[PDB]
mmCIF file of C-alpha atoms in Angstrom:
data_model
loop_
_atom_site.group_PDB
_atom_site.id
_atom_site.type_symbol
_atom_site.label_atom_id
_atom_site.label_comp_id
_atom_site.label_asym_id
_atom_site.label_seq_id
_atom_site.Cartn_x
_atom_site.Cartn_y
_atom_site.Cartn_z
ATOM 1 C CA UNK A 1 -114.584 -119.129 96.740
ATOM 2 C CA UNK A 2 -114.757 -118.974 93.000
ATOM 3 C CA UNK A 3 -116.130 -115.629 91.913
ATOM 4 C CA UNK A 4 -118.408 -114.693 88.705
ATOM 5 C CA UNK A 5 -118.482 -111.426 86.720
ATOM 6 C CA UNK A 6 -117.605 -108.825 89.409
ATOM 7 C CA UNK A 7 -119.607 -110.663 91.940
ATOM 8 C CA UNK A 8 -118.947 -113.056 94.836
ATOM 9 C CA UNK A 9 -121.478 -114.628 97.195
ATOM 10 C CA UNK A 10 -120.891 -114.293 100.887
ATOM 11 C CA UNK A 11 -120.902 -117.397 103.226
ATOM 12 C CA UNK A 12 -122.437 -120.648 101.930
ATOM 13 C CA UNK A 13 -124.754 -118.934 99.302
ATOM 14 C CA UNK A 14 -124.351 -120.287 95.648
ATOM 15 C CA UNK A 15 -125.253 -118.279 92.604
ATOM 16 C CA UNK A 16 -126.609 -120.281 89.653
ATOM 17 C CA UNK A 17 -128.389 -119.623 86.338
ATOM 18 C CA UNK A 18 -131.505 -121.553 85.277
ATOM 19 C CA UNK A 19 -131.355 -123.596 82.256
ATOM 20 C CA UNK A 20 -133.509 -122.304 79.302
ATOM 21 C CA UNK A 21 -137.177 -123.434 79.249
ATOM 22 C CA UNK A 22 -138.534 -126.101 76.786
ATOM 23 C CA UNK A 23 -140.042 -124.266 73.958
ATOM 24 C CA UNK A 24 -141.162 -127.337 71.758
ATOM 25 C CA UNK A 25 -142.067 -130.962 72.451
ATOM 26 C CA UNK A 26 -140.270 -133.909 70.850
ATOM 27 C CA UNK A 27 -142.796 -134.039 67.956
ATOM 28 C CA UNK A 28 -142.632 -130.330 67.292
ATOM 29 C CA UNK A 29 -145.596 -129.158 69.422
ATOM 30 C CA UNK A 30 -144.749 -125.643 70.750
ATOM 31 C CA UNK A 31 -145.605 -124.538 74.331
ATOM 32 C CA UNK A 32 -146.598 -120.980 75.341
ATOM 33 C CA UNK A 33 -144.229 -118.855 77.352
ATOM 34 C CA UNK A 34 -146.747 -118.402 80.246
ATOM 35 C CA UNK A 35 -146.768 -122.248 80.670
ATOM 36 C CA UNK A 36 -143.909 -124.584 81.643
ATOM 37 C CA UNK A 37 -143.604 -122.796 84.968
ATOM 38 C CA UNK A 38 -139.964 -122.245 86.101
ATOM 39 C CA UNK A 39 -136.912 -124.472 85.296
ATOM 40 C CA UNK A 40 -135.493 -126.421 88.340
ATOM 41 C CA UNK A 41 -132.301 -127.271 86.594
ATOM 42 C CA UNK A 42 -129.424 -124.840 86.882
ATOM 43 C CA UNK A 43 -125.499 -124.470 86.427
ATOM 44 C CA UNK A 44 -123.437 -123.530 89.321
ATOM 45 C CA UNK A 45 -121.644 -120.094 88.400
ATOM 46 C CA UNK A 46 -120.494 -118.783 91.646
ATOM 47 C CA UNK A 47 -119.784 -120.376 95.207
ATOM 48 C CA UNK A 48 -119.082 -118.464 98.414
ATOM 49 C CA UNK A 49 -116.121 -118.915 100.800
ATOM 50 C CA UNK A 50 -118.073 -121.270 103.061
ATOM 51 C CA UNK A 51 -119.998 -121.423 106.308
ATOM 52 C CA UNK A 52 -118.529 -120.612 109.923
ATOM 53 C CA UNK A 53 -120.586 -122.939 111.981
ATOM 54 C CA UNK A 54 -117.634 -125.289 112.808
ATOM 55 C CA UNK A 55 -115.005 -123.705 114.870
ATOM 56 C CA UNK A 56 -111.633 -123.080 113.345
ATOM 57 C CA UNK A 57 -111.253 -123.084 109.488
ATOM 58 C CA UNK A 58 -113.954 -122.652 106.848
ATOM 59 C CA UNK A 59 -115.857 -125.548 105.483
ATOM 60 C CA UNK A 60 -116.398 -125.055 101.693
ATOM 61 C CA UNK A 61 -119.512 -125.661 99.899
ATOM 62 C CA UNK A 62 -120.136 -129.068 98.374
ATOM 63 C CA UNK A 63 -120.739 -127.861 94.907
ATOM 64 C CA UNK A 64 -118.301 -126.306 92.528
ATOM 65 C CA UNK A 65 -118.567 -123.977 89.531
ATOM 66 C CA UNK A 66 -119.751 -125.784 86.375
ATOM 67 C CA UNK A 67 -121.973 -128.381 88.067
ATOM 68 C CA UNK A 68 -125.477 -129.094 86.817
ATOM 69 C CA UNK A 69 -127.752 -128.967 89.908
ATOM 70 C CA UNK A 70 -131.394 -129.367 90.622
ATOM 71 C CA UNK A 71 -132.916 -126.348 92.240
ATOM 72 C CA UNK A 72 -135.778 -126.601 94.944
ATOM 73 C CA UNK A 73 -139.214 -125.232 94.281
ATOM 74 C CA UNK A 74 -138.834 -122.127 96.344
ATOM 75 C CA UNK A 75 -136.100 -120.237 98.112
ATOM 76 C CA UNK A 76 -134.031 -118.548 95.475
ATOM 77 C CA UNK A 77 -133.187 -114.912 95.402
ATOM 78 C CA UNK A 78 -133.354 -112.774 92.113
ATOM 79 C CA UNK A 79 -130.043 -111.170 91.148
ATOM 80 C CA UNK A 80 -129.426 -108.969 88.006
ATOM 81 C CA UNK A 81 -125.941 -109.092 86.423
ATOM 82 C CA UNK A 82 -125.239 -107.402 83.098
ATOM 83 C CA UNK A 83 -128.957 -107.278 82.603
ATOM 84 C CA UNK A 84 -129.253 -111.041 82.885
ATOM 85 C CA UNK A 85 -130.961 -113.173 85.517
ATOM 86 C CA UNK A 86 -129.282 -115.449 88.295
ATOM 87 C CA UNK A 87 -130.606 -116.893 91.392
ATOM 88 C CA UNK A 88 -128.804 -116.971 94.764
ATOM 89 C CA UNK A 89 -129.588 -119.986 96.959
ATOM 90 C CA UNK A 90 -128.172 -121.524 100.148
ATOM 91 C CA UNK A 91 -125.708 -124.331 100.072
ATOM 92 C CA UNK A 92 -128.319 -126.794 101.683
ATOM 93 C CA UNK A 93 -131.079 -125.857 99.592
ATOM 94 C CA UNK A 94 -129.621 -127.491 96.611
ATOM 95 C CA UNK A 95 -131.657 -130.897 96.108
ATOM 96 C CA UNK A 96 -128.807 -132.597 94.124
ATOM 97 C CA UNK A 97 -126.330 -132.587 91.190
ATOM 98 C CA UNK A 98 -126.296 -134.385 87.872
ATOM 99 C CA UNK A 99 -123.123 -136.476 87.851
ATOM 100 C CA UNK A 100 -121.673 -136.791 84.555
ATOM 101 C CA UNK B 1 -197.880 -148.201 49.747
ATOM 102 C CA UNK B 2 -197.010 -145.657 47.121
ATOM 103 C CA UNK B 3 -195.413 -142.339 47.699
ATOM 104 C CA UNK B 4 -198.300 -140.784 45.536
ATOM 105 C CA UNK B 5 -200.668 -141.779 48.159
ATOM 106 C CA UNK B 6 -198.478 -139.897 50.768
ATOM 107 C CA UNK B 7 -198.626 -136.852 48.590
ATOM 108 C CA UNK B 8 -202.376 -137.092 48.264
ATOM 109 C CA UNK B 9 -202.734 -137.419 51.995
ATOM 110 C CA UNK B 10 -200.402 -134.485 52.600
ATOM 111 C CA UNK B 11 -202.235 -132.384 49.986
ATOM 112 C CA UNK B 12 -205.752 -132.953 51.303
ATOM 113 C CA UNK B 13 -204.642 -132.253 54.810
ATOM 114 C CA UNK B 14 -203.033 -128.966 53.881
ATOM 115 C CA UNK B 15 -206.249 -127.564 52.527
ATOM 116 C CA UNK B 16 -205.553 -128.801 49.002
ATOM 117 C CA UNK B 17 -201.989 -127.344 48.602
ATOM 118 C CA UNK B 18 -200.140 -129.275 45.955
ATOM 119 C CA UNK B 19 -196.809 -127.934 46.811
ATOM 120 C CA UNK B 20 -197.087 -128.567 50.626
ATOM 121 C CA UNK B 21 -197.913 -132.190 49.753
ATOM 122 C CA UNK B 22 -195.151 -132.461 47.202
ATOM 123 C CA UNK B 23 -192.541 -131.189 49.643
ATOM 124 C CA UNK B 24 -193.693 -133.373 52.383
ATOM 125 C CA UNK B 25 -193.568 -136.335 50.071
ATOM 126 C CA UNK B 26 -190.112 -135.522 48.994
ATOM 127 C CA UNK B 27 -188.929 -135.196 52.622
ATOM 128 C CA UNK B 28 -190.458 -138.555 53.615
ATOM 129 C CA UNK B 29 -188.684 -140.161 50.450
ATOM 130 C CA UNK B 30 -185.356 -138.641 51.382
ATOM 131 C CA UNK B 31 -185.390 -139.179 55.216
ATOM 132 C CA UNK B 32 -187.668 -142.198 55.516
ATOM 133 C CA UNK B 33 -191.343 -142.546 56.228
ATOM 134 C CA UNK B 34 -190.487 -142.560 59.975
ATOM 135 C CA UNK B 35 -187.728 -139.984 59.847
ATOM 136 C CA UNK B 36 -187.427 -136.664 61.838
ATOM 137 C CA UNK B 37 -189.141 -133.718 60.083
ATOM 138 C CA UNK B 38 -189.271 -130.287 61.737
ATOM 139 C CA UNK B 39 -191.255 -127.230 60.578
ATOM 140 C CA UNK B 40 -189.867 -123.737 61.333
ATOM 141 C CA UNK B 41 -190.621 -120.409 59.875
ATOM 142 C CA UNK B 42 -188.646 -119.149 56.793
ATOM 143 C CA UNK B 43 -187.480 -115.553 55.992
ATOM 144 C CA UNK B 44 -188.168 -116.130 52.361
ATOM 145 C CA UNK B 45 -191.415 -115.896 50.323
ATOM 146 C CA UNK B 46 -191.509 -119.628 49.262
ATOM 147 C CA UNK B 47 -191.286 -122.975 51.240
ATOM 148 C CA UNK B 48 -188.045 -124.654 51.363
ATOM 149 C CA UNK B 49 -186.822 -128.114 52.248
ATOM 150 C CA UNK B 50 -183.365 -128.690 53.634
ATOM 151 C CA UNK B 51 -181.920 -131.987 54.795
ATOM 152 C CA UNK B 52 -179.055 -132.322 57.273
ATOM 153 C CA UNK B 53 -177.108 -135.561 56.850
ATOM 154 C CA UNK B 54 -174.261 -137.240 58.735
ATOM 155 C CA UNK B 55 -173.902 -135.824 62.192
ATOM 156 C CA UNK B 56 -174.457 -131.925 62.828
ATOM 157 C CA UNK B 57 -174.598 -130.108 66.029
ATOM 158 C CA UNK B 58 -175.214 -126.420 67.158
ATOM 159 C CA UNK B 59 -171.709 -125.987 68.441
ATOM 160 C CA UNK B 60 -169.201 -123.872 66.563
ATOM 161 C CA UNK B 61 -165.503 -123.305 67.063
ATOM 162 C CA UNK B 62 -164.386 -121.538 70.262
ATOM 163 C CA UNK B 63 -161.707 -119.288 68.826
ATOM 164 C CA UNK B 64 -162.107 -117.946 65.187
ATOM 165 C CA UNK B 65 -158.445 -118.618 64.651
ATOM 166 C CA UNK B 66 -158.817 -122.065 62.905
ATOM 167 C CA UNK B 67 -160.510 -120.813 59.936
ATOM 168 C CA UNK B 68 -158.583 -122.004 56.776
ATOM 169 C CA UNK B 69 -161.300 -121.308 54.060
ATOM 170 C CA UNK B 70 -162.580 -117.751 54.478
ATOM 171 C CA UNK B 71 -165.040 -118.250 51.771
ATOM 172 C CA UNK B 72 -167.959 -118.486 54.429
ATOM 173 C CA UNK B 73 -165.631 -118.163 57.279
ATOM 174 C CA UNK B 74 -165.574 -121.971 57.765
ATOM 175 C CA UNK B 75 -163.023 -124.511 58.545
ATOM 176 C CA UNK B 76 -162.965 -127.885 56.344
ATOM 177 C CA UNK B 77 -160.842 -130.779 56.957
ATOM 178 C CA UNK B 78 -160.625 -133.909 54.971
ATOM 179 C CA UNK B 79 -159.837 -137.395 56.385
ATOM 180 C CA UNK B 80 -159.464 -135.818 59.908
ATOM 181 C CA UNK B 81 -158.894 -137.497 63.280
ATOM 182 C CA UNK B 82 -161.422 -136.960 66.031
ATOM 183 C CA UNK B 83 -160.733 -136.647 69.781
ATOM 184 C CA UNK B 84 -163.841 -136.814 71.969
ATOM 185 C CA UNK B 85 -163.361 -136.133 75.654
ATOM 186 C CA UNK B 86 -166.272 -136.278 78.261
ATOM 187 C CA UNK B 87 -164.262 -133.755 80.571
ATOM 188 C CA UNK B 88 -162.769 -130.456 79.993
ATOM 189 C CA UNK B 89 -159.282 -130.304 78.415
ATOM 190 C CA UNK B 90 -157.131 -127.586 80.356
ATOM 191 C CA UNK B 91 -153.864 -129.215 81.275
ATOM 192 C CA UNK B 92 -150.938 -129.195 78.733
ATOM 193 C CA UNK B 93 -150.369 -132.930 79.447
ATOM 194 C CA UNK B 94 -154.021 -133.682 78.610
ATOM 195 C CA UNK B 95 -153.846 -132.313 75.040
ATOM 196 C CA UNK B 96 -149.949 -132.578 73.837
ATOM 197 C CA UNK B 97 -149.904 -136.377 73.130
ATOM 198 C CA UNK B 98 -152.968 -136.046 70.778
ATOM 199 C CA UNK B 99 -151.300 -133.190 68.908
ATOM 200 C CA UNK B 100 -148.093 -135.261 68.655
ATOM 201 C CA UNK B 101 -150.075 -138.231 67.134
ATOM 202 C CA UNK B 102 -151.851 -136.002 64.724
ATOM 203 C CA UNK B 103 -148.615 -134.157 63.654
ATOM 204 C CA UNK B 104 -146.698 -137.568 63.284
ATOM 205 C CA UNK B 105 -149.689 -138.904 61.001
ATOM 206 C CA UNK B 106 -149.911 -135.416 59.259
ATOM 207 C CA UNK B 107 -153.715 -135.402 59.614
ATOM 208 C CA UNK B 108 -155.997 -132.637 60.824
ATOM 209 C CA UNK B 109 -157.581 -133.051 64.397
ATOM 210 C CA UNK B 110 -160.971 -132.036 65.470
ATOM 211 C CA UNK B 111 -161.250 -131.896 69.450
ATOM 212 C CA UNK B 112 -164.768 -132.344 70.627
ATOM 213 C CA UNK B 113 -165.197 -131.601 74.332
ATOM 214 C CA UNK B 114 -167.146 -129.721 76.969
ATOM 215 C CA UNK B 115 -164.779 -126.836 76.672
ATOM 216 C CA UNK B 116 -161.144 -126.084 76.267
ATOM 217 C CA UNK B 117 -159.631 -123.955 79.074
ATOM 218 C CA UNK B 118 -156.942 -121.279 78.800
ATOM 219 C CA UNK B 119 -153.654 -123.424 78.719
ATOM 220 C CA UNK B 120 -154.815 -126.105 76.020
ATOM 221 C CA UNK B 121 -156.653 -123.509 74.013
ATOM 222 C CA UNK B 122 -153.740 -121.219 73.924
ATOM 223 C CA UNK B 123 -151.307 -124.004 72.775
ATOM 224 C CA UNK B 124 -153.874 -124.766 70.065
ATOM 225 C CA UNK B 125 -154.071 -121.280 68.757
ATOM 226 C CA UNK B 126 -150.320 -120.896 68.980
ATOM 227 C CA UNK B 127 -149.515 -124.067 67.060
ATOM 228 C CA UNK B 128 -152.084 -123.331 64.490
ATOM 229 C CA UNK B 129 -150.714 -119.793 63.963
ATOM 230 C CA UNK B 130 -146.992 -120.429 63.992
ATOM 231 C CA UNK B 131 -146.419 -124.068 62.668
ATOM 232 C CA UNK B 132 -149.732 -124.035 60.646
ATOM 233 C CA UNK B 133 -150.836 -127.322 62.046
ATOM 234 C CA UNK B 134 -154.284 -128.218 61.143
ATOM 235 C CA UNK B 135 -156.556 -128.412 64.209
ATOM 236 C CA UNK B 136 -159.974 -127.218 65.472
ATOM 237 C CA UNK B 137 -161.861 -127.325 68.981
#
């Protein structure tokens, strides 16, 4: 399980950081902070060792550090690392990843 | 036939007041013999005649942040776009494209609607204050 800055998720949880919100539109129209909701696009920065549901060895998570993923609407857990914000999800909660 | 007869009728009916007849004749000349003439009390000592041309309605700007003249706390735009909406404008998606078109064409935008709710109004004030985009609601 690839770690992060003095942190390591346990079991299948994955720690990600949400992408920056869109401040302006294409034509230059700027949006207020209270708008635009929450960003569902994130980058995987930490992955746990894996689940233990299957007997024997450990099954690693499908994602890896450095993947761009689409988060679900709800289910994350707020974590504070070096005064910055990260979100801990489960492995199966991730909707999909942007292959590129 | 002549406006002099109109002035004479108005003078006779006003207990022989020449000024009232002249004022009524001028109003009829400038708005038509079958126009809309209203009478209201005045705070001054003399009768006054004022003509409202074009379109004018008794609804001012919602937030006093679009003022760009400050001589009379008023907002003037020349060659402006107009967006008329039957329903309230509240969503971001219901106001952004109009602002995009106005900014691309570099023309001020008047937004006449029933009301502008929190999100769209906040966007309008933010864009007016920071970018300086010409807009009014």
